[PDB]
Design an enzyme around this catalytic site. Structure first.
Site, PDB file in Angstrom:
ATOM      1  N   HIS A  28       0.837  -1.193   0.000  1.00 11.07           N
ATOM      2  CA  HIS A  28       0.000   0.000   0.000  1.00 11.07           C
ATOM      3  C   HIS A  28       0.873   1.244   0.000  1.00 11.07           C
ATOM      4  CE1 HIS A  28      -2.092  -3.396   1.818  1.00 11.07           C
ATOM      5  NE2 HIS A  28      -3.239  -2.844   1.464  1.00 11.07           N
ATOM      6  N   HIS A 263      -4.171   3.297  -3.031  1.00  4.94           N
ATOM      7  CA  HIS A 263      -4.344   2.753  -1.687  1.00  4.94           C
ATOM      8  C   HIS A 263      -3.599   1.438  -1.499  1.00  4.94           C
ATOM      9  CE1 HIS A 263      -6.854  -0.153   0.843  1.00  4.94           C
ATOM     10  NE2 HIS A 263      -5.952   0.407   1.628  1.00  4.94           N
ATOM     11  N   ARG A 357     -17.909 -18.113  38.964  1.00  3.02           N
ATOM     12  CA  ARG A 357     -17.711 -16.671  38.968  1.00  3.02           C
ATOM     13  C   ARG A 357     -17.454 -16.144  40.378  1.00  3.02           C
ATOM     14  NH1 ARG A 357     -23.974 -15.780  39.240  1.00  3.02           N
ATOM     15  NH2 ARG A 357     -23.750 -13.579  39.826  1.00  3.02           N
ATOM     16  N   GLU A 411     -17.012  -3.948  24.735  1.00  2.00           N
ATOM     17  CA  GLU A 411     -16.270  -5.189  24.939  1.00  2.00           C
ATOM     18  C   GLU A 411     -15.030  -5.252  24.052  1.00  2.00           C
ATOM     19  OE1 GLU A 411     -19.768  -5.940  23.967  1.00  2.00           O
ATOM     20  OE2 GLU A 411     -20.524  -5.836  26.028  1.00  2.00           O
ATOM     21  N   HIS A 473     -28.360 -14.940  25.122  1.00  2.03           N
ATOM     22  CA  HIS A 473     -27.423 -14.797  26.232  1.00  2.03           C
ATOM     23  C   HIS A 473     -26.874 -16.135  26.708  1.00  2.03           C
ATOM     24  CE1 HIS A 473     -29.270 -10.876  26.120  1.00  2.03           C
ATOM     25  NE2 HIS A 473     -28.502 -10.423  27.095  1.00  2.03           N
TER      26      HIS A 473
HETATM   27  C1  LIG Z   1     -11.413  -4.732   9.981  1.00  2.00           C
HETATM   28  C2  LIG Z   1     -10.835  -4.526   8.621  1.00  2.00           C
HETATM   29  N1  LIG Z   1     -11.686  -4.563   7.580  1.00  2.00           N
HETATM   30  C3  LIG Z   1     -11.141  -4.369   6.374  1.00  2.00           C
HETATM   31  C4  LIG Z   1      -9.797  -4.164   6.155  1.00  2.00           C
HETATM   32  C5  LIG Z   1      -9.248  -3.937   4.777  1.00  2.00           C
HETATM   33  N2  LIG Z   1      -8.761  -2.554   4.581  1.00  2.00           N
HETATM   34  C6  LIG Z   1      -7.526  -2.159   4.831  1.00  2.00           C
HETATM   35  S1  LIG Z   1      -7.323  -0.519   4.557  1.00  2.00           S
HETATM   36  C7  LIG Z   1      -8.976  -0.349   4.093  1.00  2.00           C
HETATM   37  C8  LIG Z   1      -9.518   0.980   3.651  1.00  2.00           C
HETATM   38  C9  LIG Z   1      -9.613   1.987   4.769  1.00  2.00           C
HETATM   39  O1  LIG Z   1      -9.269   3.280   4.222  1.00  2.00           O
HETATM   40  P1  LIG Z   1      -8.142   4.214   4.800  1.00  2.00           P
HETATM   41  O2  LIG Z   1      -7.700   3.843   6.164  1.00  2.00           O
HETATM   42  O3  LIG Z   1      -8.660   5.651   4.654  1.00  2.00           O
HETATM   43  O4  LIG Z   1      -6.976   4.029   3.759  1.00  2.00           O
HETATM   44  P2  LIG Z   1      -5.985   4.913   2.900  1.00  2.00           P
HETATM   45  O5  LIG Z   1      -6.707   5.700   1.880  1.00  2.00           O
HETATM   46  O6  LIG Z   1      -5.215   5.785   3.916  1.00  2.00           O
HETATM   47  O7  LIG Z   1      -5.012   3.926   2.318  1.00  2.00           O
HETATM   48  C10 LIG Z   1      -9.616  -1.534   4.170  1.00  2.00           C
HETATM   49  C11 LIG Z   1     -11.048  -1.817   3.862  1.00  2.00           C
HETATM   50  C12 LIG Z   1      -8.985  -4.135   7.323  1.00  2.00           C
HETATM   51  N3  LIG Z   1      -7.666  -3.935   7.269  1.00  2.00           N
HETATM   52  N4  LIG Z   1      -9.517  -4.321   8.541  1.00  2.00           N
HETATM   53  C1  LIG Z   2     -23.665  -6.698  23.823  1.00  2.00           C
HETATM   54  C2  LIG Z   2     -24.126  -6.835  25.237  1.00  2.00           C
HETATM   55  N1  LIG Z   2     -23.225  -6.582  26.200  1.00  2.00           N
HETATM   56  C3  LIG Z   2     -23.663  -6.707  27.457  1.00  2.00           C
HETATM   57  C4  LIG Z   2     -24.939  -7.097  27.797  1.00  2.00           C
HETATM   58  C5  LIG Z   2     -25.379  -7.178  29.228  1.00  2.00           C
HETATM   59  N2  LIG Z   2     -26.228  -6.030  29.613  1.00  2.00           N
HETATM   60  C6  LIG Z   2     -27.536  -5.990  29.444  1.00  2.00           C
HETATM   61  S1  LIG Z   2     -28.178  -4.515  29.905  1.00  2.00           S
HETATM   62  C7  LIG Z   2     -26.614  -3.910  30.311  1.00  2.00           C
HETATM   63  C8  LIG Z   2     -26.443  -2.533  30.891  1.00  2.00           C
HETATM   64  C9  LIG Z   2     -26.665  -1.420  29.896  1.00  2.00           C
HETATM   65  O1  LIG Z   2     -27.499  -0.421  30.532  1.00  2.00           O
HETATM   66  P1  LIG Z   2     -28.705   0.319  29.830  1.00  2.00           P
HETATM   67  O2  LIG Z   2     -28.959  -0.138  28.445  1.00  2.00           O
HETATM   68  O3  LIG Z   2     -28.525   1.839  29.947  1.00  2.00           O
HETATM   69  O4  LIG Z   2     -29.911  -0.079  30.756  1.00  2.00           O
HETATM   70  P2  LIG Z   2     -31.172   0.582  31.443  1.00  2.00           P
HETATM   71  O5  LIG Z   2     -30.626   1.369  32.633  1.00  2.00           O
HETATM   72  O6  LIG Z   2     -31.943   1.415  30.490  1.00  2.00           O
HETATM   73  O7  LIG Z   2     -31.963  -0.597  31.977  1.00  2.00           O
HETATM   74  C10 LIG Z   2     -25.675  -4.842  30.088  1.00  2.00           C
HETATM   75  C11 LIG Z   2     -24.206  -4.717  30.308  1.00  2.00           C
HETATM   76  C12 LIG Z   2     -25.820  -7.322  26.703  1.00  2.00           C
HETATM   77  N3  LIG Z   2     -27.092  -7.686  26.877  1.00  2.00           N
HETATM   78  N4  LIG Z   2     -25.398  -7.198  25.436  1.00  2.00           N
END
Ligand SMILES: Cc1ncc(C[n+]2csc(CCOP(=O)(O)OP(=O)(O)O)c2C)c(N)n1
Ligand SMILES: Cc1ncc(C[n+]2csc(CCOP(=O)(O)OP(=O)(O)O)c2C)c(N)n1
Ligand SMILES: [Mg+2]
Ligand SMILES: [Mg+2]
Lengths: 666, 672
Positions: A28, A263, A357, A411, A473
């Protein structure tokens, strides 16, 4: 200011990169050409590193190229800087056993701090590196001793900032007020498939401002002075992380600049010549002007040596003034777990039934008391995951000494930041989320496997026993999804004693991510685990309950919560006259790295009557169960029901295992 | 516009929700209590639904509850609406075989548009649904016929918006100016673990404004009039998606309100009563006030039927005016494939070598021509994925009829949007990235499997043949990672003819997502494929090259790119008087679906000399090679080198296949 030699250095980076891509007929070139000025300014005037000492210096400013497709520019920079990337190493770009892989890889090439192919993870890893610096600065810095005073820098692209991990990480970073995180954005306004106009029209700087970030726009990517001034402003913002947006023409000087064509494909010898014409580059190929080499030597090797020597002297005085703490610093960065760390670790008895846990929390609490470099958190699940260190403060801008991290429902960002914290050194991290949401952080687990980073994942709620939350879940395939992955240690503890010992594997692991698969359901303590677990979990699989005979007629294999069914089955089978061995296999991987003799003790080749009970998918169980063997697994999705009921309905009853064993015996 | 009957309706939603959580002893009451006002205002006054027709009205407004933990509020709402959720169902909340699962599940429960437990995916499915409306509107709407004119609504909590899939999708939504997508945000300022001060201090609205969204902040979550006013404003902003942040007190009324305690645990009976005192609720348990039921019936049942009937009259008139487009509209929604969809599909000859990605481009483009509903895109990887249709235009605000979607580097968002598009209906969706980045979109593959949604994943660059991009861009564990997952069809086509059939399997699949694993490198066309692939790839595994003689001495099993090595090895082994059958196994999943008899035809139990050659992890190959069989596999990460070299060094040479088989003879087993 910036002189003619400085612009030569910029164009040296440009030419070295584009020549290296061409020789490889892969790579690249556009980003190297566009981002060469911002890279040059950073390394020569603002990045404090000693190339001579490689990554051994603890207080080196940390730099991550999140946009790994610009590997050639990084390798060009490492060569110029005095890292051990040779001109010949550059020529072997993207070739077999090269020290110059197509995407930067840590521990493969000198001076690369992170493996940064996949997009957005590098930023997130850089976030974690600043989290670490703030933490280690608060932990160890005393008045008149700035033992940690370094900045984390990243160079990203439009792709990095379209990815959720970066967005999660950038909100996190803004919340954590990581003023020392300076991300440079190569806003070339282009991406792989075309212009940013076709999919990316947001105000990135405003978003970052909403996160709590400073946003600086350098409208000329080729104005070194404007970039250097921006870095200083970012350094002056001590309360906020900073995004310096550098507008660049991708493939600067090339015929097809400002297009997607530059690119990811070699520019072509036409492109190189025309680009050199713009630069006035009439130098030979793979040649570094002497002026440039001396500039890099004065700017980086000479200055860098002076800075580390100065830091080393401060640490000398620091050690005299504060001997116990300085030793802690030294031991943490060398990954030395404190003496008698495991001494007060919890033990459990046969009467007990505690969730894995809760058992993990108890191990965590003593680990935190013993190991001052142990720290971590959860993705808003600490209560559910029991990942919280009571008696320790939260990791806040106000108390960076705190070792409880509120990652938020981020996460992937947690996982990638964790990879960055491990990479930084001085700390051992853990991160908590439910097992079913390993899916969210999976790419960072794969990066941890490649990077050989001793990250610990505290992933709880292992099975359908969660129950009422239901199929979304309840993990089924997740245990298999991690086991196929090369480089990951996945342990499902079967009781508290196995849990303690699993944590001990993770603490003593130095080159691999460790996933702990823990249970919401209460786990009865099994027969031998108190006495033999510490020694035998590390062996991956062991004979928890042996057959009465030397050779078992059958053998029951089980992981985690389902090993209790196995021992109960053993007795019922005995009453009908059948003698079976119960094997606890907490970890597939740990068992496979054992001797053939050990594998034979646990799974003798004679016994083809193998039944495996796991609240998970059956994929890969024939490795141990066999073509002829039987397995009680879940090859379907979950339900919303009391967990005890789901297990019962899914065949996880002592009676069903007896029947399946007896049918196999036929 | 709102009366005491309406506040009683809000209190009714809350009480049913918290009562159901207590009877279950499990659930999340906090969001229902604080969000029931905003849910009530949207459903009763701004949501165009006919509960009687369930999910069968094509121009119905789509509501997605992205915060699945507030399931009970949805279930209460469905009962009140006229949907087939009984008071008795609510009592069975979170219990075995209930119609009221702990987190909402599509198909299981009437009128639930999406399975939305995992956070952030719901907003992304919503975004895709709005994409689907815009495309279908532009494709089918003609002058004086508003065939498609429905808004997309989602209710989210702080956790949803923290997640990266939401942030991607929101950026995508603003770029695509989906002004008919409106998200309602429960800014309760609380998360499971505690306050949002501890992890979430950003200005959400400022970020969303940078996205190109509109931000309306309703400071009184209990003011129904203000909420409704904001929903009107949002519909008024047609050029911008809208986030209505309604600031709520989580668990309003309960003693533990504004705390993490009300989030995910039953209040307890004392808490229910204390909230009822604030509510002024003296009603018995699980009771809908007669006033509230009639208010719901008027607002949604009667009005909704009138709207569907009004739509139906227009559609019939549209049918007369534009019969062709109308039949297409029905058939696209019905999932009926056009009659000669398979006719022009590409066929390939033995003398040809072509990458499956290039074969897929050719199958796609003919599929686009024959099937109007067919559309899709990639995550900035069209050149590499070969997923573009040359004839059609991009899906832009200017050309919403365009069938080429530029998702950007947003793989998670793409797959969740894809799930929304398919759930909405009227279109078939394909989405493209590298196979190594399925990990980025993995949670949405799982949701598609749980939702039985026939999304097509065009995942290319399958092996270490990727080469110089390196370990990070070279898949290893990925194939097993999705072959372990339930309810997913993963096809690795070995040549162009298998690739066509793979696409056909996906186009004829109604109940499952299908992942197509395709190759950067050119794949030579195999012996029997031009003739047998169309009928045998659907069977998962087949004998591409039979043994010379009925019972083979060995089975060489290979998938995808590596099958050619097996056929070449068959020749070399045949030259040395060793007779093996080459079995190509595109899909584990499809083969295990077949009869016990068919499996014996493909893999006779009698033959235990088996070598499986696949440039991927050995996981789950022991099922077929057997304990005494052998595998030419990669159980380690790749390298940055030209791709052909990596394969050679990793043992994907003809010699190694021959030699691995020959060493099988040396075993004591196979002696005798
Ligand atoms: C998670 C992920 N999805 C896809 C790719 C493939 N990929 C590498 S660079 C790129 C384009 C992103 O554009 P940018 O960072 O602006 O590139 P530039 O014009 O600076 O080369 C893609 C899709 C990757 N490396 N990682
Ligand atoms: C991707 C994902 N990560 C974590 C969880 C666990 N989880 C469920 S509700 C929650 C808290 C998020 O709070 P919010 O959506 O603001 O809840 P509210 O106070 O409105 O009930 C978490 C960590 C999930 N269900 N999905
Ligand atoms: Mg760019
Ligand atoms: Mg909330």
């Amino acid at each position: 200011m910036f002189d003619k030699i400085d612009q030569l250095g910029v164009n040296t980076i440009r030419t070295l990169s584009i020549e290296a891509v061409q020789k490889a007929n892969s790579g690249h070139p556009g980003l190297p050409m566009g981002a060469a000025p911002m890279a040059y300014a950073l390394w020569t005037k603002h990045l404090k590193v000693n190339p001579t000492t490689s990554k051994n210096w603890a207080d080196r400013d940390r730099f991550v190229l999140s946009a790994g497709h610009g590997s050639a520019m990084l390798y060009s920079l490492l060569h110029l800087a005095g890292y051990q990337v040779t001109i010949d190493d550059l020529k072997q770009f993207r070739q077999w056993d090269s020290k110059t892989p197509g995407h930067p890889e840590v521990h493969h090439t000198d001076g690369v701090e992170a493996t940064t192919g996949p997009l957005g993870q590098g930023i997130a890893m850089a976030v974690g590196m600043a989290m670490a610096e703030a933490h280690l600065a608060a932990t160890y810095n005393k008045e008149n001793f700035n033992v940690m005073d370094h900045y984390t820098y990243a160079i990203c692209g439009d792709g990095d900032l379209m990815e959720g991990v970066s967005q999660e990480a950038s909100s996190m970073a803004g919340h954590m007020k990581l003023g020392k995180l300076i991300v440079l954005y190569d806003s070339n306004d282009i991406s792989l498939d075309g212009p940013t106009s076709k999919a990316f029209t947001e105000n990135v700087g405003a978003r970052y401002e909403a996160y709590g970030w400073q946003h600086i726009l350098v409208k000329d990517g080729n104005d070194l002075e404007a970039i250097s001034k921006a870095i200083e402003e970012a350094k002056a913002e001590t309360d906020k992380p900073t995004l310096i947006e550098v507008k660049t023409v991708i493939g600067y000087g090339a015929p097809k600049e400002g297009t997607s064509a530059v690119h990811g494909a070699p520019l072509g010898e036409d492109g190189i010549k025309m680009a050199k014409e713009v630069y006035g580059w009439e130098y030979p190929d793979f040649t570094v002007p002497e002026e440039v080499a001396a500039r890099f030597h004065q700017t980086m090797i000479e200055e860098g040596q002076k800075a580390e020597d100065a830091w080393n002297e401060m640490f000398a005085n620091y050690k005299k003034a504060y001997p116990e703490l300085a030793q802690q610093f030294e031991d943490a960065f060398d990954g030395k777990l404190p003496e008698n760390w495991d001494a007060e670790l919890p033990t459990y008895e046969v009467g007990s039934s505690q969730a894995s846990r809760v058992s993990s929390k108890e191990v965590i609490q003593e680990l935190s008391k013993a190991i001052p470099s142990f720290w971590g958190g959860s993705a808003d699940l600490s209560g559910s995951n029991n990942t919280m260190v009571a008696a320790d403060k939260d990791f806040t801008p106000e108390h960076y000494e705190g070792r409880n991290i509120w990652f938020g429902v981020r996460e992937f960002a947690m996982a990638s930041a964790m990879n960055g914290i491990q990479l930084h050194g001085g700390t051992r991290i853990y991160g908590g989320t439910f097992f079913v949401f390993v899916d969210y952080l999976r790419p960072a687990v794969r990066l941890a496997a490649i990077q050989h980073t001793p990250v610990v994942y505290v992933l709880t709620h292992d099975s359908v026993a969660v129950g009422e939350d239901g199929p979304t879940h309840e993990p089924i395939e997740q245990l298999a999804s991690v086991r196929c992955m090369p480089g990951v240690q996945v342990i499902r503890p079967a009781d508290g004693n196995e849990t303690r010992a699993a944590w001990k594997v993770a603490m003593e692991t130095t080159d691999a991510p460790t996933i702990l698969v823990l249970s919401r359901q209460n786990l009865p303590v099994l027969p031998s685990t108190k006495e033999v677990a510490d020694e035998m979990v590390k062996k991956g699989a062991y004979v928890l309950s042996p057959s009465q005979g030397e050779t078992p007629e059958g053998i029951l294999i089980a992981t985690g919560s389902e090993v209790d069914l196995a021992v109960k089955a053993q007795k019922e089978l005995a009453e009908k006259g059948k003698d079976v061995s119960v094997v606890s296999m907490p970890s597939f991987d740990l068992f496979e790295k054992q001797s053939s003799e050990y594998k034979e003790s646990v799974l003798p080749k004679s016994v083809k009557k193998r039944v495996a009970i796991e609240a998970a998918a059956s994929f890969g169980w024939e490795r141990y169960v066999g073509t002829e063997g039987a397995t009680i697994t879940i090859d379907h999705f979950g339900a919303s029901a009391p967990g005890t009921k789901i297990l019962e309905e899914f065949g996880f009853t002592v009676e069903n295992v007896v029947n399946t064993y007896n049918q196999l015996s036929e």
